[PDB]
Chains A and B, each alone.
Chain A
Amino acid sequence: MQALLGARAKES
């Protein structure tokens, strides 16, 4: 979740 959402790293 973190590396995928980048600046928006939110879910897990």
Chain B
Amino acid sequence: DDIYKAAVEQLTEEQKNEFKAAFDIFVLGAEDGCISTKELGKVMRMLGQNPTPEELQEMIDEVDEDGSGTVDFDEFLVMMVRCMKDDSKGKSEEELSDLFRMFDKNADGYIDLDELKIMLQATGETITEDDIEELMKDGDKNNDGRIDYDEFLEFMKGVE
């Protein structure tokens, strides 16, 4: 959920106070005052849409930063920055291959933790082996100790 909380960070927080007032409104129909699954149904009919107990509960999961089983206010910010289809360039076989050429610096086919640390250190931004290794895992669903390209897709899926 660090993408939605980064949007929170990268965007202004007065929109977040706006969503706080909207969440105060989201006590209406809320036997909890919050946005739970049922409360997401009623908040969305208060918001205009209506997701499903799976869609409401999954947005909950999709806003479960803490795993609070609800859409909390912070989770409601996540929601408002979460209910569309925008993450672009769909980097896949073609584009993530263009990338994997450098992700897998090796010109071989595996972003090992060294390939990943090198690519990150090349990003210019601050790099941690927490970063490098969490991203290894996001890769290493096959768990090669080294991000394969399928691991690379389980890692950078849609991410741009």
What 1/0 mask marks residues of chain B from 11 to 51 whose CB sits below 8 Å from any chain A CB? 00000001000100000000000000000000000001000
Inter-chain CA distance A4–B44, complex, in Å, is 13
User: Main secondary structure on chain B at its contact with chain A?
Assistant: helix
User: Main secondary structure on chain A at its contact with chain B?
Assistant: loop
Chain A contacts of B22 at CB under 8 A? Answer: 11
Number of A residues, CB within 8 Å of B: 4
Chain B interface residue count: which class? under 10
What 1/0 mask marks residues of chain A from 1 to 12 whose CB sits below 8 Å from any chain B CB? 100100000110
B23 vs chain A, min Cβ distance (A): 12
Q: Say yes or no: A10 contacts B18, CB within 8 Å.
A: yes
B98 vs chain A, min Cβ distance (A): 34
Q: Say yes or no: A4 contacts B48, CB within 8 Å.
A: yes
A2 vs chain B, min Cβ distance (A): 11
Inter-chain CA distance A10–B48, complex, in Å, is 14
Inter-chain CA distance A7–B27, complex, in Å, is 23
Chain B contacts of A11 at CB under 8 A? Answer: 18, 22, 80
A3 vs chain B, min Cβ distance (A): 10
Inter-chain CA distance A1–B83, complex, in Å, is 14
A9 vs chain B, min Cβ distance (A): 12
| Chain B CB within 10 Å, residue with most, of A1, A4, A10, A11 | A11
Q: Say yes or no: B48 contacts A1, CB within 8 Å.
A: yes
B positions within 8 Å CB-CB of A: 18, 22, 48, 80
